[PDB]
Amino acid sequence: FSSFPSSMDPYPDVRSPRLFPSSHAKRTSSMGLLQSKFASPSISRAQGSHSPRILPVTPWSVPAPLAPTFVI
């Protein structure tokens, strides 16, 4: 039923195109890796070290309002 739930989540179609809608998706508390890769690419766009430490920090917190902060 997880796939069905994912489909339902994708069914909302809140707006095009948003990382804020990506956060609306993380509302379920489950985040796809692709998003993480995109975030890493954005970070890339000492910096590498920060990403390594920033990514670790994001990993440390999975709680609501933490992922948003980690993403920021």
Next chain:
Amino acid sequence: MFVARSIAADHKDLIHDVSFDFHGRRMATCSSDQSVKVWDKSENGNWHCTASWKTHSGSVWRVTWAHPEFGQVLASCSFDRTAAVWEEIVGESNDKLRGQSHWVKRTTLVDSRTSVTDVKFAPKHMGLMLATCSADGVVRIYEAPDVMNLSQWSLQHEISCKLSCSCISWNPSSSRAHSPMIAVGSDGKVQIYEYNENTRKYAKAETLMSVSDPVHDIAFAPNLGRSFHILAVATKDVRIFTMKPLRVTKFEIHTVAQFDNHNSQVWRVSWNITGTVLASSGDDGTVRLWKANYMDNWKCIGVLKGD
């Protein structure tokens, strides 16, 4: 007429890996000379090299062949921190002849921040999928989500390990019958991995204990006609582990056998196509073939030597 004789690889520097295709007719080699050679076993029995090209900037540790349904694809692995996918190309004009074959790059995987030890294609049922493990100690899985786009390689997953040696080996079990899982042997404690239901993430089901020395090699055996699974490690000792799922947790290991008759490092461990025979090689310069007993103990059938 047929003869098996020693043949020169044509590699200036040392040869890290040799791999057979699906048929067993073709061989791929890689070395520290930065070149990949592909051999054709002619119908006249002599191996002749099909092609050799400069794949990478730095030494090429590992190579592998994908399933022949996808096409002629070889993946390579280097100290340059890249993996490359290559597709064999033959062109023939809608007329007899006119076909030309040369190595080509489908894609590059830059994501590994450090020198990569190994690369392996997953089983054919899964799709184009491969795993790689590096000095960053991060196992990465890449998929081609479109079979048609051989350049479209997405990064499916990333997991953390430890730091030093590395080897990978997928479960070759056909899926429908079994679930995907993969053993990683680095350096020393080594922990394998399985795949979760719809988390779609790799979990650590269990670990292979009793490992001695650095883990030179690991391979999973084809589970054809057997419920249980077998993995052999060439440490500086040979070990065989039996995995059984049963049914939270759903894994068990037993250690089938240990074998030190090499008296030294076991560099390579390889399995038969059926999983019937295991092989081991080491610093004694001896290659041992193994059979399973009725008791499920392993016995050495015989030993090849060389000097």
Next chain:
Amino acid sequence: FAAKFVSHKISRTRWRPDVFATGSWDNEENKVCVWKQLCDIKHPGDVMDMQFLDKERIVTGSSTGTVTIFRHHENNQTLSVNQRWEQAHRAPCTAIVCSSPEIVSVGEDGRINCFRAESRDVLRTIDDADSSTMHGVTFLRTTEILTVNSVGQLKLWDLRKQGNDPTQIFSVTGERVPLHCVDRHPNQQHVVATGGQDGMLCIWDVRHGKMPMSLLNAHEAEMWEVHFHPSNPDHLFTCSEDGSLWHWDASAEITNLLPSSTLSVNSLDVLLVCGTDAEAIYVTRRLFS
């Protein structure tokens, strides 16, 4: 019926131009012997086209579009290496028949390439890129031809005029089978019959319309081959792809009357053997009884 099994999953054998020879795939040395055995020769490259072009001369088309010819001087037991060709079809020819001054050949991709007698120069070529495997081939009124693709696609073509189009087309309503069997009558150079995959008995009237003059399924698997009598047109017998020749007594019956219950059969000429789908090992020696 004597079955001198000689341990080679034989691809071909034919009546002497008692007298005979044989040819086989499925080994390192491509296997072909004469005859109690005359000239058991090895060669590299398969046997797709097979016609002993004299008591000496003997031609053979091989798997890579290759075509080997030699001359079996049985007196000195020596074979003069008559002719060689690299890329005919590189698939093999998927049938072989004879034409006046040339072989009525065809191949799977359809490279209708005409080697002819002393035409080491391959002059003529209808290089129509036949998509399905053309395995139906004969001279009808040479050079009246008909390429039959593996949609059973009996398109009547030409080679004496030019242009790569086919002259006509014979087909069943559905196009179910791939090409294995046809039947050009010795009674008439126009009369034919499509032997197909269901033990499928079809008959092709050229001169009288072109409908399915027959549709009758008797044998189990796909169309193997037959042995007509080389002067008795009516007497023949029909198999299917396991090899089981039912005594399709059109001289007058058909039953379980072969030396049957084996694997497949090799090639057809009888005055004696036939050919099934998997081309396997069998023998016979009493072909008038």
